[PDB]
Every structure is written in C-alpha cells, then in structure tokens.
Design a protein around this ligand. Structure first.
Ligand code: NA
Length: 450
C-alpha cells in the first residue's frame, strides 16, 4: 500500500515532502531531442516504468524543449503539452518525482544540436565553417553568436522562452509529483567564454543570473509555487567555479524553492566517448571530480539551498563511484544519464546497474546523518536524528544485492515492515539517534562513517 506522492519543498539544503520527511532522489534522465516530440508509442512504456520501480528509482529528469513547446514564433503547441503531461502522469502515478528539463545541446537544430527553435535565433552556420558536432561545436563562431543573442535578448528569445516555460508551468500546476522546472540545460556563455578561464567569470555570471531570475519570474507569474532548478553556466564542466548567489558580485537569492542543478562528468571519460581519445586518461577522474564536489560545497555553504546532480555517468561504469560516494557523503541525490524508452531487456543488470541500484533512504523522518552503501555485497548503514513527521522513514532495499534475502537491525527504533519487503519502514523509539543496518544475513555488515 504505497505512500501517496507529494510536492517537495526546499527548507535550507533539504527537500521536504508533505509528511515532513527529508527526501533523497535517485533516478534517471529521459530526454527526447528530435521532432516529433514524445510521439505515440515512443515514450516510456509501462514496462520501462516497472524497471525503474523494481530498482527503487524515485525520480525522472524528463526532457522538454523550447522547440517542442513553441515550434513557431509565439505559438504554444498545446498538443505537445498533452503528450508531455501524459508522460508526467504515468510517472508520478508510480511514485516518480518528475523534473522537467528545458534541454538543449549546441543551441539548436541549425548546428545539428537541439533546443531553441530555429525561428528564434538569427545566427546560422556557414557552409564553409567546420562543424565537429557534439561537444566541440560550442567552439563554432556562429554558434557563439547565437548564444550572444540569447544573453543579449537581442531578438527577444528569452522573452519567448519565458512565455514557453510559463505555459508549461501553468499546465502542470497542482500536480503533486512534479518536482520543478530546470530552466536551461548546459548554458554556454557564448563569445564571452574565454573570460571564464582559468578562474571563472563573475561578470558573465551576473548576466546569466539575471537571465535565470527573469525566466524564474516568468514561470512564477503562471505557477506561483513550482520549484525552479538552476544550473551553473556550463564552464562548470571544464572545472571553472560558479559565481551564482555571491553578493556583491551577484545578488543573493530572494526567491523561494530554488535548487542548484550541477552536472558531474569526468572529462577524459567524455573525451574517450566522443573523441575516441585514450581511455587510460581516466586516471585523472578522481582529482577532477573532487574539484567539482568542492565547488558544490562552496555553493551549499554560501547559498544554503538544495543540490541535485542532474546528470552524470553516460554509460561508463568506472567513473560512477566518484559521483555516488561523494553524493552519499553529502546526502545529495542524482539523475543518471541516460535511460531510453522501449527497453527490450533490463539495462541495470550489468556493471552500471550494480552501482546505481542501491539500498537507500527515499524519505527520512529526521535529519540525515552519515550513510554508506557497499555496492559489491550490499552492506548498508545509516544514522539519523528523528524529527516530527507524519510518516516513517522509508528505505528502499536493492533487488540485486541480496539473493538469499536480507537482514535488518535498528538501534533507537523499530522496523515496522514485513520480512523481505522492498521498502523497510522504520519508526524512531524516541528523540535520540537511530541507526539502521541492512545486509545479507551472514554479513557482519557496515558501520556508520564518522
Ligand atoms: Na522525438
């Protein structure tokens, strides 16, 4: 008898459900980049969704786009919105929190990418201008001029985008399982971009933040409570720090329910995939990804807002641990890149799923303390400080790591769920801390880190 899904509300760095619990989101991306968008029979099937439920994922970052929403100047495609909300409804019905991602790569279809409709941008690539495709096409001069039109609002592209996202926000208003709208995927600074290296670009980030605030105000005009997800400018992904929410250079946040939405990629991993460069360069992944997490802690410290890693992974099993362990350390959730529609087989049964499919606290009736999961043998430990809530702590138990069943021990509380349940429910005995251990019956188990 599943817990009805609610809206999520930011309270400091916590995402808090309607029962007063602190929520941890683990999930996947699902993004349609090509017209026609979300056409019948090519969206997530009941079976696709069963895969996600079975492995205990509770969030989908669902792609939409400016092009999908407004495929002709000033005209909302209301039929696209019907199809999108059909997908949203199928997901939230099965307990998935849906983050609506306003997606783009390479600005637009004019460059072989996606996102902005061609009618909205004047700049176009030349026949003689080399296009190396994704991801290096961000170095194309004509693509950079496109981005300048965006940040300059030269032809009202941001005004139109505001309208488009406002229309989306209006359509999903009042739906409990919608976690928010992510304003723009991987924003590129355009011709300004070398100012971001090698130490960040305070000036551009003032421009970018004003743009995001403007889109936020357009969204909130239509749907006054919907959360908004803000990415750092994408030179983040080339190790440059963000200057968001950093007065006096950029304004402090005065908008409620804003969540930070960084990506966490290993450069050499991505270079090997898209450029065919040597895979053994991934020896650099750990120090490089440690830098990103340090940048995240800095945002957390000065802004005191939540963070969700909105994409990472991209099929490389060797880099996952970097994200997963650091996220666990900070009790930060994530959405893996990428989960496609119409799986004939379950894609989480190999090396990738072994690490993504985890035992973890979907919702905690308390302040999270330290947590650890061992993805080889399933050992799990978690401690938290009880807080008033109207539902118990719910911990999803991996369906992959316990072939002989699992055992549970609780100190400071009681397990109220049945033997072998996919969800362990835990009620606190009192005000003191609760420690939960879940493991194979013959394991000595894990210890809470400290
Ligand atoms: Na499509």
């Amino acid at each position: 008898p599943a817990t009805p899904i609610t809206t999520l509300q930011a309270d400091g760095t916590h995402l808090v459900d309607g029962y007063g619990r602190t929520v941890l989101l683990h999930g996947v991306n699902n993004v349609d980049k090509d017209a026609p968008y979300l056409p019948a029979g090519e969206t997530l099937t009941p079976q696709d969704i069963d895969i996600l439920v079975r492995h205990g994922f509770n969030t989908v970052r669902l792609g939409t786009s400016f092009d999908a929403l407004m495929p002709q100047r000033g005209q909302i495609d209301e039929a696209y919105l019907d199809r999108l909300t059909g997908v949203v409804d199928a997901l939230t019905a099965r307990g998935m929190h849906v983050l609506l991602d306003n997606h783009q790569d390479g600005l637009s279809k004019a460059w072989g990418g996606n996102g902005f409709p061609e009618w909205a941008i004047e700049s176009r690539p030349r026949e003689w201008e080399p296009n190396p495709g994704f991801p290096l096409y961000y170095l194309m001069p004509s693509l950079n001029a496109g981005w300048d039109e965006v940040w300059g609002n030269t032809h009202g592209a941001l005004d139109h985008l505001g309208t488009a996202l406002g229309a989306l926000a209006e359509r999903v208003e009042g739906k409990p399982g919608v976690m928010g709208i992510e304003l723009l995927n991987e924003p590129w600074p355009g011709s300004r971009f070398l100012s971001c290296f090698p130490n960040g670009c305070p000036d551009f980030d003032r421009t970018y933040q004003a743009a995001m605030q403007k889109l936020t105000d357009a969204v909130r005009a239509q749907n006054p409570t919907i959360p908004v997800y803000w990415e750092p400018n994408v030179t983040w992904n080339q190790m440059m720090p963000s200057n968001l929410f950093a007065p006096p250079v950029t304004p402090a946040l005065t908008t409620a329910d804003v969540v930070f939405a960084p990506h966490d990629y290993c450069i050499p991993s991505q270079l090997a995939i898209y450029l065919g460069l040597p895979q053994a360069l991934r020896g650099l992944c750990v120090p490089q990804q440690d830098l990103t997490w340090s940048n995240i802690d800095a945002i957390t410290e000065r802004a005191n807002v939540p963070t969700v890693i909105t994409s990472f992974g991209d099929g490389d099993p060797t880099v996952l641990k970097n994200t997963l362990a650091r996220a666990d350390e900070r009790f930060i959730g994530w959405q893996y890149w990428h989960f496609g529609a119409g799986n004939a087989t379950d894609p989480f049964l190999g090396e990738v799923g072994r690490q993504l499919v985890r035992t973890y606290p979907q919702a905690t009736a308390g302040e999270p303390g330290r947590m650890i999961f061992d993805a080889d043998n399933g050992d799990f430990a978690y401690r938290f400080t009880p807080r008033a809530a109207t539902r118990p702590t719910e911990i999803f138990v991996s369906d992959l790591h316990y072939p002989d069943g699992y055992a549970v021990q609780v100190d400071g509380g009681q397990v109220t769920s049945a033997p072998g349940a996919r969800i362990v429910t835990v009620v606190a005995d009192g005000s003191g801390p609760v420690t939960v251990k879940i493991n194979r019956p013959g394991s000595a188990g894990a210890e809470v880190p400290d």
